[PDB]
Amino acid sequence: SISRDEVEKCINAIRFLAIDAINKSKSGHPGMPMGCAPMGYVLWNEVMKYNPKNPDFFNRDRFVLSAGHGSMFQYSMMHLTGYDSVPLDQIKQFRQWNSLTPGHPENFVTPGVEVTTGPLGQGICNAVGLAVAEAHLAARFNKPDVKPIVDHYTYCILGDGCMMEGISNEACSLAGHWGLGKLIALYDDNKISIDGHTDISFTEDVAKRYEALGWHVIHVINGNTDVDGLRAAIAQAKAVKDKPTLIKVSTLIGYGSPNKADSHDVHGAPLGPDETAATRKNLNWPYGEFEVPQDVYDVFRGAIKRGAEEEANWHKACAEYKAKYPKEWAEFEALTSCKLPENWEAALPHFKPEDKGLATRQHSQTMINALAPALPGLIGGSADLAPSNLTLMKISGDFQKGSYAERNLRFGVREHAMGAICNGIALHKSGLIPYCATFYIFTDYMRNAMRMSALSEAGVVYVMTHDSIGLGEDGPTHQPIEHLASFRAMPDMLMIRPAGGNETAGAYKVAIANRKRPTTIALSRQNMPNIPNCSVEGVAKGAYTIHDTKAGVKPDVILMGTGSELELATAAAGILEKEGKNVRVVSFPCWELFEEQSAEYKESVLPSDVTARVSVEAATSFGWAKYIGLKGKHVGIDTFGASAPAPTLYEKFGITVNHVVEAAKATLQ
Amino acid sequence: SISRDEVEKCINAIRFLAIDAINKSKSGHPGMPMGCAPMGYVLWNEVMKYNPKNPDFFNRDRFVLSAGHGSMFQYSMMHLTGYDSVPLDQIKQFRQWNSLTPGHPENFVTPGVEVTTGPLGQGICNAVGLAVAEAHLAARFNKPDVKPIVDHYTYCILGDGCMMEGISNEACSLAGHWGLGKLIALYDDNKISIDGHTDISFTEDVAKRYEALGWHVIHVINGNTDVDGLRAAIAQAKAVKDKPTLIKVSTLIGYGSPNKADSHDVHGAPLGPDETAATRKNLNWPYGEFEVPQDVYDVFRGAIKRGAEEEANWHKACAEYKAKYPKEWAEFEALTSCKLPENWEAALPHFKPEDKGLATRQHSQTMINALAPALPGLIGGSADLAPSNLTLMKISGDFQKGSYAERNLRFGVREHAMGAICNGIALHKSGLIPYCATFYIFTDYMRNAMRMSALSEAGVVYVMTHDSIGLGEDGPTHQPIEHLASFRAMPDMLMIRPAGGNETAGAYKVAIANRKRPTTIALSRQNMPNIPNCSVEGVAKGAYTIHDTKAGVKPDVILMGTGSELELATAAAGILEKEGKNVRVVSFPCWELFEEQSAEYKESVLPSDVTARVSVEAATSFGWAKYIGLKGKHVGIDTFGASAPAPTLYEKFGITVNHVVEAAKATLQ
Ligand SMILES: Cc1ncc(C[n+]2csc(CCOP(=O)(O)OP(=O)(O)O)c2C)c(N)n1
Ligand SMILES: Cc1ncc(C[n+]2csc(CCOP(=O)(O)OP(=O)(O)O)c2C)c(N)n1
Ligand SMILES: [Mg+2]
Ligand SMILES: [Mg+2]
């Protein structure tokens, strides 16, 4: 193949592409890409299997840059190996408006970028999810007497910042526990973070911690020039079937810069023109700005013929499989196509007012079990709360290292990693539909991962029980107050709060339909009735009318409610009606969906000339003015809660039928 | 001395007080308290130095229950040893309205409870902070010549949940890095969590991970009956000065219950009548409901005498210290009183409009440096972003194992533990004023800790820079959108967004005065002018008027802005005024403070008959209807951002002077 001198020229081409891009943008991070260039060379030219001309090739290795600030590293590699989403012109538009080379890698913008990173620690956890998906599909579909149709590795580059974040310890505890032997993490061990040398705050023995988590650990003491040792480490990682592998690769940040290498000044500011000149001279690099010599392209652009071959070979393995296993093939194809099975929505049961009330956590359990046999891709579970959140799929066992084909994911007390893992599962783009769960209050532990589902267009289903003071005695550390508001404010997240059976089914219907946008479902601990006119379809409208006192007669006062509080509005309406008032009750299960409706629909629910308006929800008034206006009133709770039985809490905090009636009268003047 | 038999009676009294209390409430967690009773007996009767009749005794050892679901354990020990906050009638009111025995321990309700737990992992981190406070004060004030005036240990009991949470790895990494030898953590290694046996999701080698983090580890294989071994273990921990110590104590959850021990069924539900009778029989306990034998009280109530004597001996040591070191004593006394120095607010600078328009992050650095000499208790720092958040106190070094007297805390990339550690520092109740910092977007990593500051009444100052799209090219993973709304919605948190120098000084003034309520301050990356009539005092009003076209005449239109966008409102005002409109501009730095003002004040700023209202803020419209109404308009950004230079982002997303003008025209109808 080719020489050490050519390998070195290839390595330096990665460094100077990154340097020159960041000097032109006047913004970004040259240090990590300079220190990691040798790893790039090996991974892209020699190890990973991928098709640069088909970023969606199902059986490709997955790469994740968890250290997302080094985005020029990944962009350089993609450019060099011939991805059409990163031509030279896009290298020259790093960090500019509408480029395909944003400051941190974004899956939703750049074909070949698998997940969105930037928030340290997310990527490694996304990688654990990508490896979960590969292990699961492999266990479900590979057969011992033909070539596999699922067989690929998951590679992740991460730095010191990822290693300090708690979320990465969570995810990597789970990866050890699951024995995910095709996950290979490469740690850029460069002794530098933003504050300076890592000895200022970070002296732990990372390798020992990883051994404790159940990982194999390989030490590459010279990541700057030991290409043979990186080749050997990666080969050894692949021969460890049984445990995930951490390759601790010691580098100099900004390797090549004579004056700024090994300093935090090369972390995150361009080298600039004098040091750039000095680095060119120090690395013996006579090529001009953005000039990659053609012989380096000849090397890396070899990925194209290799990638076409790998993909053709896979198609042959699939043809051979399909010949002996036509039924299993059909199921594999239908799942990995990402198309939802025809009529899956018909699996959802329906309810009537006559049916005795259940908690929406119980309805949720019903929907998960109704859907699981209809949706082969449904996978997931709770963060140590299965007997409370009610999330188990009865038709499957527990995903474990003995048993990867099982579909219940048991995350333990690891909310944050759980959300990020689910992002990886979704973004494998294999038809897996991940759901995860905890008490709604503990969305606070996993908030960045949830925001990441929204930003990266990953249809993760967040199943969040015990949604209010209705949980009772556990008290204010466990009772949501600001949570609904905090999610309504978040861009591109659906926040659904169903009242009764039909609305819970309707929440799940929205959630499953939405394969490119996450849905958070707030569910009750306590029973609620099935209220007349509540419906599956109404949830899809976001807000809809469930009661008018007289057809064709404009309401005097509009009462709007969600979840367990909808019954307070319907009961208040009956009291106000018996007095002589005309009342509309509106159910408001999903504010985002309401805002997508036509102006005429919105006006049909909340007529602009009826300004007597009351909202009822066991949560803060914050946000509700959007619908209740300045002259309206909220019945809810804006303070923290308390430790007492639920019925006492509703009484003491004034979240009662009588309060809604009183507020309505106040709005009427 | 005390007999082995009598020690066993004492341990069983703890078990049955917990059991009996939980059966009466019909709610709560008997399993942990049953498994951990032997560790309670040893800690309370033999190890810890405390005065049950003075829960504020400055030199007490601090205990923290990180596994806060086992609250009846702590309440039983406090009752038995004579804390007046937990008489028997309060044990009989566990989890009931307005009791001093809430379902999870709350510092803000029960004197003697040091912090609030319930959310797994918080407590251990709070313990790291309490230990940081002791070490810092001991280094600052102890002299080699006389007895110490600061010398106490920090004990923490935590379980498997706490161990699984990433937050605890973060804080224990720092505890090891800082060599906090007076932190002693007792791990309830019971192999049980809510989902069942821990092997379902948690098989890591915890002991080896703690060794990697820099801790001493001691194994107690029989925490159920080996009292001598617990005694030895704790003694050995007090003799390792150099490292924090984890004592891994294996117990049987629910020890004593012949049918429900070692099962998740004893985790979280009362034993109930049949199993309680069976457990009484199995443990040979003839005493009735809530009946603690006289001889067991005679033992635990020994704490009263011992405590009086410990505190008196401390006073002697302080009298001896003060006789030799009058200067130092006076400083110690003044700090530790928690009273702020006379006229500390005069330290803060004032600004005029033609002063150079700095970023509010630069103004924040000025305030930090202004206050550090004036406020002896100011302590804290950034999560690896000192050079970008601009948070260093120039007059001090870095807190480290060699140098505990220094005041800058260098947290590394550990936002969540950083907040919880600060809660522990503040809640030491020794006059330390902690501040901590990251990019505002990463509040999402640390959200529960921040919430616990609010709930626990800890005046942590959250210094949060890069508050918007004004940061530019790092793009949407770094750009806040929903974050101002998400904190305005949080109970008992101040969310301040200062425009200019004076407002930034004003934000700091609020934040310092608030020792019992946290303050989050959203600060800009980018420069902004000092606007005429912006003021230190106006921040305290929450919203205030900075411009009227003509004094004494009602505005036609009200423009309200915050932070970097306030200049858009002022610039718009001028344009509207040239068209003949009378315009009022209102700066809105803190919503919570505005809502504290009188009805007359609020009406003076926002007259209820002027409905033409525009808000401008580079964040979502969510929430603003509270002030803008149904008829007003918001100029901001409700979507995620993008990776480009900041000026391009403002133009592209329409956050411009001319958009505010057109919106004001639209509201005028
Ligand atoms: C969760 C989170 N916290 C903070 C930041 C801000 N930030 C960006 S890079 C960085 C330092 C990371 O150091 P390291 O991963 O070792 O990168 P190197 O400087 O070695 O390239 C930080 C703190 C971030 N991106 N995400
Ligand atoms: C952050 C957080 N997530 C979830 C919970 C819900 N919860 C309460 S106790 C518990 C499990 C406790 O396991 P462990 O700490 O081992 O306690 P044990 O059952 O052994 O007493 C959980 C998951 C919580 N309290 N906090
Ligand atoms: Mg580094
Ligand atoms: Mg346990």
By C-alpha distance, which of A619, A443, A488 is closest to B451?
Answer: A443
CATH number at residue A644: 3.40.50.920
Structure tokens at A152: 């690929």
Residues 6+ apart with CB under 8 A from A320: A146, A147
Q: Does residue B413 line the site of ligand 1, with CB under 6 A?
A: yes
Q: For chain B, how many residues are written?
A: 669
Establish how many alpha carbons lie within 13 A of residue B495's alpha carbon, considering only the half-sphere containing its beta carbon.
21
Give the C-alpha separation, A75 to A113, whole Å: 9
Of A193, A214, A626, the CB nearest to B413: A193
Structure tokens at A64: 């994740």
Contact residues, chain A, for B106 at CB < 8 Å: 475-477, 643
Q: Tell me whether residues A382 and B195 touch, CB distance under 8 A.
A: yes
Q: With beta carbons less than 8 A apart as the criterion, state whether A417 and A170 touch.
A: yes
Structure tokens at B98: 């307005």
Query: Which atom of ligand 2 is nearest to B161's Cα?
Result: 15
Q: For chain A, how many residues are written?
A: 669
Q: With beta carbons less than 8 A apart as the criterion, state whether B586 and B558 touch.
A: yes
Q: Does residue A253 line the site of ligand 1, with CB under 6 A?
A: yes
Establish how many alpha carbons lie within 13 A of residue A11's alpha carbon, considering only the half-sphere containing its beta carbon.
24
Tell me the C-alpha to C-alpha distance, in Å, between residue B544 and each of A129, B13, B592: 50, 60, 13
Domain end position, chosen among A523, A540, A557: A540
B461 phi and psi, to 5 degrees?
-100, 110
Residues 6+ apart with CB under 8 A from B140: B404, B405
Establish how many alpha carbons lie within 13 A of residue B526's alpha carbon, considering only the half-sphere containing its beta carbon.
17
Establish how many alpha carbons lie within 13 A of residue A541's alpha carbon, considering only the half-sphere containing its beta carbon.
20
Q: Does residue A420 line the site of ligand 1, with CB under 6 A?
A: no
Ligand with an atom nearest the CA of residue B254: 2
What would you report as the CA-atom Rg of chain B, rounded to the nearest whole angstrom?
A: 28
Residues 6+ apart with CB under 8 A from B392: B365, B368, B381, B386, B408
Which DSSP string do the residues of B127-159 spell out, in sequence order? HHHHHHHHHHHHHHH--TTS--S----EEEEE-
Q: With beta carbons less than 8 A apart as the criterion, state whether B246 and B215 touch.
A: yes
Domain end position, chosen among B512, B540, B568: B540
Residues 6+ apart with CB under 8 A from A381: A391, A392, A408, A409, A410, A411, A435, A436, A437
Q: Tell me whether residues B160 and A413 touch, CB distance under 8 A.
A: yes
Give the C-alpha separation, B73 to B234, whole Å: 19
To 10 degrees, what angle do helices A122-141 and A415-427 make? 60
Query: Which atom of ligand 1 is nearest to A162's Cα?
Result: 15
Identify whether residues B479 and B551 lie together within a single domain.
no
H-helix or E-strand containing B188? strand B183-189
B632 phi and psi, to 5 degrees?
-80, 180
Q: With beta carbons less than 8 A apart as the criterion, state whether B148 and B313 touch.
A: no
Tell me the C-alpha to C-alpha distance, in Å, between residue A92 and each of A256, A296, A313: 22, 19, 35
Q: With beta carbons less than 8 A apart as the criterion, state whether A622 and B622 touch.
A: no
Query: CA of B102: which chain A residue's CA is closest?
Result: A643
Beta pairing, strands A613-616 & A557-561 = parallel
By C-alpha distance, which of B472, B567, B486 is closest to B525?
Answer: B472
Q: Which long-range contacts (CB under 8 A, 24 or more apart) does B650-655 make?
A: B650/B469, B650/B470, B650/B618, B652/A97, B653/B469, B655/B469, B655/B565, B655/B568, B655/B616, B655/B618
Amino acid in the structure at residue B109: V
By C-alpha distance, which of A159, A438, A655 is closest to B195?
Answer: A438
Structure tokens at B609: 């008959």
3-state SS assignment for residue A127: helix
Domain end position, chosen among B279, B312, B333: B333
Which DSSP string do the residues of A198-256 spell out, in sequence order? GGGT--S-HHHHHHHTT-EEEEES-TTT-HHHHHHHHHHHHH--SS-EEEEEE--TTTT
CA distance to partner chain B, nearest, from residue A630 (Å): 5
B2 is in an annotated binding site: no
Q: With beta carbons less than 8 A apart as the criterion, state whether B142 and B150 touch.
A: yes
H-helix or E-strand containing A319? helix A302-324
Residue the block writes with tokens 């007895």: B147
- Provide the Cα torsion A352, A354, A359, A361; round to 10°: -30
Contact residues, chain A, for B120 at CB < 8 Å: 413
Count of domains for chain B: 3
Give the C-alpha separation, B214 to A540, whole Å: 53
- Cβ neighbours, 10 Å, residue A346: 9
Give the C-alpha separation, B275 to B255, whole Å: 12
First to last CA, chain B: 86
Structure tokens at B550: 């003509």
CA distance to partner chain B, nearest, from residue A472 (Å): 9
Query: CA of A116: which chain B residue's CA is closest?
Result: B477
Helical spans, DSSP H, in A457-515: 483-488, 500-513
Residues 6+ apart with CB under 8 A from B438: B382, B383, B385, B389, B415, B418, B445, B446, B464, B465
- Paired with A216 in beta bridges are A245
Query: Which atom of ligand 1 is nearest to A68's Cα?
Result: 25
Q: Does residue A471 line the site of ligand 2, with CB under 6 A?
A: no
Identify whether residues A211 and A284 lie together within a single domain.
yes
Q: Is A249 exposed, middle or buried (0-12, 13-18, 19+ CB in 10 A)?
A: buried
Identify whether residues A276 and A356 lie together within a single domain.
no
Identify whether residues B513 and B644 lie together within a single domain.
no
Identify whether residues A42 and A191 lie together within a single domain.
yes
H-helix or E-strand containing B614? strand B613-616
- Paired with A614 in beta bridges are A559, A633
Give the C-alpha separation, B356 to A109, whole Å: 39
- Which residue range forms the structural domain that includes residue A307? 2-333
- In our burial notation (b when 16+ CB lie closer than 10 A, e otherwise), range B560-599 reads bbbbbbbbbbbbbbeebeeeebebbbbbbbbbbbbeebee
Q: Tell me whether residues A638 and B491 touch, CB distance under 8 A.
A: yes
Tell me the C-alpha to C-alpha distance, in Å, between residue B60 and each of A425, B112, B169, B583: 50, 11, 27, 59
By C-alpha distance, which of A438, A594, A436, A307 is closest to B120?
Answer: A438
Identify whether residues B305 and B267 lie together within a single domain.
yes
Tell me the C-alpha to C-alpha distance, in Å, between residue B398 and each of B157, B408, B435, B536: 29, 5, 14, 31
Identify whether residues A495 and A474 lie together within a single domain.
yes
Structure tokens at B513: 């005065």
Q: Angle A21-A27-A31 (CA atoms, 0-180°, nearest 5)?
A: 70
Catalytic residue among B106, B275, B415, B617: B415
| Chain-centroid distance, C-alpha B123 | 10
How many A from CA of A194 to the centre of ligand 1? 7
CATH number at residue A260: 3.40.50.970
Amino acid in the structure at residue B388: S
Q: Which residues of A are catalytic?
A: 415
Q: Tell me whether residues B414 and A166 touch, CB distance under 8 A.
A: yes
Alpha-carbon torsion B222, B223, B229, B234, what sign? positive
Structure tokens at A111: 């074909």
Q: Does residue B411 line the site of ligand 1, with CB under 6 A?
A: no
Q: Tell me whether residues A473 and B208 touch, CB distance under 8 A.
A: no
Q: Tell me whether residues A412 and B623 touch, CB distance under 8 A.
A: no
Q: Where chain A is broken, by preceding residue (C–N > 2.5 Å)? A: none
Give the C-alpha separation, A321 to A315, whole Å: 10
By C-alpha distance, which of B100, B98, B58 is closest to B79?
Answer: B100
Of B68, B413, B472, the CB nearest to A161: B413
Give the C-alpha separation, B549 to B556, whole Å: 10
Give the C-alpha separation, B426 to B420, whole Å: 10
Identify whether residues A457 and A555 lie together within a single domain.
no
Identify whether residues B520 and B580 lie together within a single domain.
no
Helical spans, DSSP H, in A356-459: 360-371, 415-427, 447-456
Q: Name the resolution in angstroms.
A: 1.7
Q: What is the DSSP letter of A404?
A: T
B73 is in an annotated binding site: no
Which DSSP string do the residues of B482-499 spell out, in sequence order? SHHHHHHTSTT-EEE---
Residues 6+ apart with CB under 8 A from B465: B361, B364, B385, B388, B389, B390, B437, B438, B439, B440, B523, B524, B525
Of B95, B452, B639, the CB nearest to A473: B95
| Chain-centroid distance, C-alpha B117 | 10
Alpha-carbon torsion B538, B541, B547, B550, what sign? negative
By C-alpha distance, which of B523, B472, B483 is closest to B501?
Answer: B523
Structure tokens at B473: 């090219």
Amino acid in the structure at residue B655: I
- Cβ neighbours, 10 Å, residue B46: 14
Residue the block writes with tokens 């053709």: A312
Q: Does residue B474 line the site of ligand 1, with CB under 6 A?
A: no
Structure tokens at B595: 């809502």
Q: With beta carbons less than 8 A apart as the criterion, state whether A442 and B448 touch.
A: yes
Give the C-alpha separation, A135 to A152, whole Å: 9
Give the C-alpha separation, B454 to A444, whole Å: 14
Beta pairing, strands B196-197 & B192-193 = antiparallel
Amino acid in the structure at residue B498: P
- In our burial notation (b when 16+ CB lie closer than 10 A, e otherwise), range B265-290 reads bbbbbbbeeebbebbbeebebeeeee
Mutate to test the interface with B, among A170, A415, A474, A488 (most CBs of B within 10 A): A474
Method: X-ray
- Beta strand ranges found along A47-153 (DSSP E): 62-65
Ligand with an atom nearest the CA of residue A66: 1
Identify whether residues A561 and A490 lie together within a single domain.
no
Residue the block writes with tokens 């049987």: B252
Of B202, B213, B452, the CB nearest to A412: B202
Identify whether residues B389 and B466 lie together within a single domain.
yes
What would you report as the CA-atom Rg of chain A, rounded to the nearest whole angstrom?
A: 28
Identify whether residues B123 and B205 lie together within a single domain.
yes
Structure tokens at A452: 């990441």
| Chain-centroid distance, C-alpha A659 | 40
Q: With beta carbons less than 8 A apart as the criterion, state whether B459 and B514 touch.
A: yes
Q: Angle B328-B330-B332 (CA atoms, 0-180°, nearest 5)?
A: 70
Question: Which mutation among A167, A413, A474, A643 tests ligand 2's pocket best, with the greatest number of atoms within 8 A of CB?
Answer: A413
CA distance to partner chain A, nearest, from residue B320 (Å): 37
Ligand with an atom nearest the CA of residue B384: 1
Q: With beta carbons less than 8 A apart as the criterion, state whether B499 and B359 touch.
A: no
